[PDB]
Amino acid sequence: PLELTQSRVQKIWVPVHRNSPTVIVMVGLPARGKTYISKKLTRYLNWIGVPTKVFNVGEYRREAVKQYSSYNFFRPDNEEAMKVRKQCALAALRDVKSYLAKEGGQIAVFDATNTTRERRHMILHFAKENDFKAFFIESVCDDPTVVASNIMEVKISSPDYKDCNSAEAMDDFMKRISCYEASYQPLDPDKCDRDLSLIKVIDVGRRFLVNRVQDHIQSRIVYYLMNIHVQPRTIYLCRHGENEHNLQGRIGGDSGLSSRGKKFASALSKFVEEQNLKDLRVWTSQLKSTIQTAEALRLPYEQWKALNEIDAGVCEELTYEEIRDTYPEEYALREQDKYYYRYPTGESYQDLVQRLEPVIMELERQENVLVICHQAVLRCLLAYFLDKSAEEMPYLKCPLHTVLKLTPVAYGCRVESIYLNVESVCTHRERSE
Numbered sequence: 001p002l003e004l005t006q007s008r009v010q011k012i013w014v015p016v017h018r019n020s021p022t023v024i025v026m027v028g029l030p031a032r033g034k035t036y037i038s039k040k041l042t043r044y045l046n047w048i049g050v051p052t053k054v055f056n057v058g059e060y061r062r063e064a065v066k067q068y069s070s071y072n073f074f075r076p077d078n079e080e081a082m083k084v085r086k087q088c089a090l091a092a093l094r095d096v097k098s099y100l101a102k103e104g105g106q107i108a109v110f111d112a113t114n115t116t117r118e119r120r121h122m123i124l125h126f127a128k129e130n131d132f133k134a135f136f137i138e139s140v141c142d143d144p145t146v147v148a149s150n151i152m153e154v155k156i157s158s159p160d161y162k163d164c165n166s167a168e169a170m171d172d173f174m175k176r177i178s179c180y181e182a183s184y185q186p187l188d189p190d191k192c193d194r195d196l197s198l199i200k201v202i203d204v205g206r207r208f209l210v211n212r213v214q215d216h217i218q219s220r221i222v223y224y225l226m227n228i229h230v231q232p233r234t235i236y237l238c239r240h241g242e243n244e245h246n247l248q249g250r251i252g253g254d255s256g257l258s259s260r261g262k263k264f265a266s267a268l269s270k271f272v273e274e275q276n277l278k279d280l281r282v283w284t285s286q287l288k289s290t291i292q293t294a295e296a297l298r299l300p301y302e303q304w305k306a307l308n309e310i311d312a313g314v315c316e317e318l319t320y321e322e323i324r325d326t327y328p329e330e331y332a333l334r335e336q337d338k339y340y341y342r343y344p345t346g347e348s349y350q351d352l353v354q355r356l357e358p359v360i361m362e363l364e365r366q367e368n369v370l371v372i373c374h375q376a377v378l379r380c381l382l383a384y385f386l387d388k389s390a391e392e393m394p395y396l397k398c399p400l401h402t403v404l405k406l407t408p409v410a411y412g413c414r415v416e417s418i419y420l421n422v423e424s425v426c427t428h429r430e431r432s433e
């Protein structure tokens, strides 16, 4: 029954006067997108604030053993290589234990083939004895075009194949896959795996079998998988054209575009038209400056309250100088912990991420999209796509009148900056000390 004090940074009332971690087990033949999924899921989970880390058994093998030479290493009759592979799995599990039990981790993604019941049974046993949950994700695909595309995009360029050309790396990889085919026992949720928590994904997200979801992190993972796709597309992110508050160095508010902001809007329209995209969706916030920017495009657009700039609470409409003079401790606390700091009666970047989550989910479902938003919001989105930490997120550089063009490549995202040659003030503030 305790008396309360409001914490300085997060503004949380706390009393004063003195969920088991999960191992996600990937399952499947090589080149079925296990690593692609492990990495993308981990980016999502970390961004929403669930500390996650991938333990790729392949990387342990590459460190334990000299340069790769061929698929013979993966022969099931290779007694020695089988021992090494098993010890690499056990070493990766030691690190999973340490991460989840001792380093604050919440989710460990065990990224390997794990194609045998025996291997999976051993992982289960490891989980139950450390009191970890286990959740299996299996990717099944028998389409040779898909497999070949995966091999060309991320396998032949890997360090294993440094001394091979393309044709021979591809030949080797195909034989390598064949090494796993005889002993591959797929997840069997009807019968033998009836009691496991799992998702089996068939044909690149065409069909799912989902068995026994045990907690909210798991249903959300499932929802995420049911919304992502691997079709090629482009995401453009930018801010509103310069506005009248920007000219005054004032934060928040709902001002309109300055004369230069309107020139940017016309320049954006020209840029978009020259990209020559199919079915470009345009999203804005509900604040005037983004909507006036979209109005220059002559494309249909949709407004989202969730894309509204961070709410600076009682500091809305003020300059950073007025904040420093009127609220000196608040100004200092934010410079010290810019991600977690909440403005009084307002928001933190942490809050932003919670309200942007539905934006991210819908972005995953779409194809070509242009998002016209605001500085702190744009940083949050960009952090997601580029896998930037919470500590880095509030300092990412997203200038006015510059389009950030994002294109999926390999296991991530390429970003290209395109400045549309219209002057503006600069609203970027570096980390100080």
Ligand SMILES: CN(C)c1cccc(-c2cc(Nc3cnccc3S(C)(=O)=O)cc3nccnc23)c1
Pocket: 031, 032, 033, 034, 036, 037, 139, 140, 141, 146, 147, 149, 150, 153, 154, 201, 203, 204, 205, 225, 226, 227, 228, 229, 230, 408, 409, 410, 411
């Ligand atoms: C959509 N969803 C829900 C989902 C779920 C699980 C796997 C995959 C998947 C993803 C994938 N991606 C991937 C893997 N390596 C290189 C490039 C890419 S790509 C297409 O992202 O540029 C390749 C796959 N292959 C076979 C089966 N499944 C694959 C997808």
Ligand SMILES: O=P(O)(O)OC[C@H]1O[C@](O)(CO)[C@@H](O)[C@@H]1O
Pocket: 246, 250, 251, 252, 253, 309, 310, 312, 374, 375, 376, 394, 427, 429
């Ligand atoms: O987190 P920072 O660096 O203060 O940036 C957010 C600010 O940027 C702006 O979008 C432009 O100054 C403000 O409206 C908002 O308060």
